[PDB]
């Protein structure tokens, strides 16, 4: 019809023809070569494919059995650790070892500092992410609630000169914490000279030097009165704009006029949880944008060039002016009806991303006609991570996988490298292997805690009501499965080589707890964790600056913090845990964040958006945190607590709210009154009621379901 035949695939006509016309075109890859590579790659690995699908359902019903035929209400852990063994599910773990993965660039194997996700199909939040590798740390602070808006201190419509104060002595603390002076105060400086290649900062009295002079990286302007001094900390660069001439600068006792922080030193452009694709046309959206930025001509705005010093003792060089970029495909999961094969079925995602998204990377390895030839890797690498795998054998499927795709891409063995995240419960307990598996991929690992718990539930669905969504956050098993995710990765010797990466901060209003709370994920020798916006990743680079990442890997170096006991601890909650008014609230709770999420998904194709809970804090949904909150609602289903029409209820009264928080935004057709006529409402609905059905929790096939649903309604 609409679609191309090679070999045994029928292929959606508008995929075909971007891949032919803009994705091979400057690849020298010869494109009927591409393509049969396709056929055969996606002949070879769909059974084992499949296979390694049809074996979760397996483990799982196993599971859901073991716990259906006891009754002892404290879990005998010797048991179920001899039950897991038994069949599979937690294998014996390695010896030693150290990976071996080579050619990666240096803001992985050695900067710690933020890591960025942002939703690919957004090209304009795609380019302000590569933009973010340097952001306004005078922006970020007035912009947020870190400088709270006591009395005075408010936003207004124009520049509130005491808010503007109290963000120029916020900064000049960080300046004094960061690059201290051998004597005095930042706050007290008056200029900036370089003098013989060393930096000086005149004091009112006398004028001082850096306590650590290595701390000085650079300048701008004339050495005797710079436009700009550049510093490192940890290994991340600070700038201090001067001009007196400015609105700031005019304010302030030295003429600066901001300082500057490298922020997100790599971003991670989502084709995952944060975006909705859910045929060949939304394919392409994303992977023209994917191409955009690796061919650096990307134009919603444009991507930033890199940036330009004088070194202490005067000679030039330059700073990259862009995140280094990972791409996040799908996972071992979904089929896609963007290619067909002559059956009709549809062919599964994720080989498909791994053929074109490693194929447009390939544009990322080479200079760019449109920015100082920038080179995503200058290394060679191009950096996938791959989510949502479950044990040993899918990560070593997706190594095979990738394996096939550089022989069909002409490129050499292991140019795909891996970050792992560990989000699912058979990855934590056989971690060890599955970073063997990858040994010679694999650049980090990350701790995506939200998809984490959604299979914690789902897991141990039969085998009581677990806690309140809120309460797993700090629950035994998690705590568990953070430290022993960063003991697994410094035991094979990620330090200097590869992230030991933690999870996403969601409240993106909430900057101020931001920066006082996330700081502990650099404590725990996390060398990157995930932001949701330029504006935090500059505001968590703070904590990179406070704490030395590098140190504390090193002293963490040997110790096992978390047993399998610990790991295996399952969130169930205590015999009368709530009262029903608690009970309604975590309800009340889910609802509504299932609603704003689910109507914005199915409805107009955005796969993430800003939801307030129940408590009004504004979070930042996609499809982990929608899996929590089904798979929750689905558990309390199961076994009691609340009943269908309190479900019901909870969805009908939540729903007229979420009508009024996206009221007139013109493509918004509304769920209420009448509910069962919403395709939306009706998603919403079947996550819940169908939750404990759905394989391992996960919300895509309801959810593609439901948005193809409204799109050959609206088409009609
Ligand atoms: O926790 C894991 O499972 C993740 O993988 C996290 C994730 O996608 C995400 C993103 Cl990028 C933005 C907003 C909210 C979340 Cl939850
Ligand atoms: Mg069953
Ligand atoms: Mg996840
Ligand atoms: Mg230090």
Redesign the pocket.
């Known amino acids: 019809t609409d679609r191309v035949s090679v070999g045994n695939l029928r292929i959606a006509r508008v995929l075909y023809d971007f891949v032919n016309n803009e994705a091979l075109p400057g690849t020298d890859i010869d494109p009927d070569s591409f393509w049969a590579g396709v056929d055969k790659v996606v002949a070879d690995l769909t059974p084992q494919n499949q296979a390694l699908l049809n074996a979760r359902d397996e483990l799982q019903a196993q599971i859901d059995k073991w716990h259906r035929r006891r009754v002892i209400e404290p879990i005998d852990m010797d048991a179920y650790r001899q039950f897991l063994t038994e069949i599979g599910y937690l294998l014996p773990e390695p010896d030693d070892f150290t990976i071996t993965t080579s050619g990666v660039d240096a803001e992985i194997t050695t900067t710690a500092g933020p890591q960025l996700?942002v939703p690919v199909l957004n090209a304009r939040f795609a380019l302000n992410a590569a933009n973010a590798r340097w952001g306004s740390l005078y922006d970020a602070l007035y912009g947020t609630d870190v400088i709270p808006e006591t009395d005075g201190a408010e936003k207004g419509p124009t520049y509130n000169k005491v808010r503007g104060d109290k963000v120029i002595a916020y900064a000049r603390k960080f300046l004094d914490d960061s690059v201290p002076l051998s004597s005095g105060s930042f706050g007290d400086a008056t200029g900036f000279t370089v003098q013989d290649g060393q930096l000086v900062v005149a004091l009112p009295d006398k004028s001082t030097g850096l306590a650590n002079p290595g701390q000085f990286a650079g300048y701008t302007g004339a050495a005797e009165s710079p436009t700009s001094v550049l510093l490192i900390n940890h290994g991340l660069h600070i700038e201090i704009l001067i001009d007196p001439e400015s609105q700031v600068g005019t304010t302030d006792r030295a003429g600066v006029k901001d300082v500057i922080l490298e922020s997100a030193i790599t971003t991670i452009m989502?084709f995952?949880?944060?975006v909705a694709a859910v045929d060949a046309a939304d394919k392409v959206l994303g992977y023209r944008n994917w191409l955009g930025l690796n061919k650096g001509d990307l134009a919603a705005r444009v991507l930033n060039r890199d940036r330009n010093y004088t070194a202490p003792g005067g000679g030039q060089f330059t700073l990259p002016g862009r995140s280094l970029m990972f791409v996040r495909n799908v996972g071992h999961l979904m089929t896609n009806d963007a290619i067909v094969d002559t059956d009709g079925s549809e062919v599964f995602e994720g080989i498909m991303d791994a053929l074109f998204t490693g194929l447009i990377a390939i544009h990322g390895l080479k200079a760019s006609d449109v920015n100082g030839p920038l080179i995503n890797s200058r290394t060679g690498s191009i950096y996938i991570v791959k989510?949502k795998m479950h044990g040993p054998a899918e990560v070593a499927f997706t190594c095979e996988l990738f394996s096939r795709v550089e022989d069909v891409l002409g490129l050499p063995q292991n140019t795909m490298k891996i970050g792992i995240?560990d989000?699912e419960r058979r990855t934590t307990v056989n971690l060890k292997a599955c970073i063997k598996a990858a040994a010679d991929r694999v650049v980090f690992i990350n701790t995506?805690?939200?998809?984490?718990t959604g299979d914690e539930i789902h897991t141990s669905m039969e085998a009581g009501p677990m806690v309140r969504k809120g309460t797993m956050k700090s629950q035994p098993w998690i705590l568990a499965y953070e430290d022993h995710n960063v003991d697994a990765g410094l035991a094979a010797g990620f330090s200097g080589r590869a992230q030991v990466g933690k999870?996403?901060w969601?409240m993106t209003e909430l900057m101020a707890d931001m920066v006082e709370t996330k700081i502990a994920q650099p404590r725990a020798g996390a060398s990157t964790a995930?932001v949701?916006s330029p504006t935090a990743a500059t505001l968590h680079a703070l904590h990179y600056h406070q704490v030395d990442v590098a140190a504390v890997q090193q002293g963490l170096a040997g110790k096992r913090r978390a047993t399998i006991e610990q790991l295996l601890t399952i969130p169930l909650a205590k015999e009368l845990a709530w009262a029903p008014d608690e009970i309604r609230e975590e309800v009340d709770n889910n609802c509504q964040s299932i609603l704003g999420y689910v109507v914005r998904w199915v409805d107009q194709g955005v796969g993430?958006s800003k939801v307030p809970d129940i408590h009004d804090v504004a979070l930042?949904?996609?499809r982990?945190?929608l899996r929590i909150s089904s798979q929750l609602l689905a558990n309390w289903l199961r076994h009691g607590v609340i009943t269908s029409a309190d479900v019901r209820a909870s969805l009908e009264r939540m729903a007229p709210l979420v009508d009024r928080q996206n009221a007139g935004d013109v493509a918004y057709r509304p769920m209420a009154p009448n509910f069962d006529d919403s395709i939306a409402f009706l998603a919403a609905q079947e996550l819940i009621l169908s939750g404990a059905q759905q394989p391992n929790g996960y919300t895509e096939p309801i959810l593609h379901r439901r948005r193809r649903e409204f799109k050959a309604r609206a088409a009609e």
């Open positions: 996700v989502d995952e949880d944060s989510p995240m989000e995506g805690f939200l998809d984490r999870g996403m969601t995930w949701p993430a930042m949904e996609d982990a945190t």
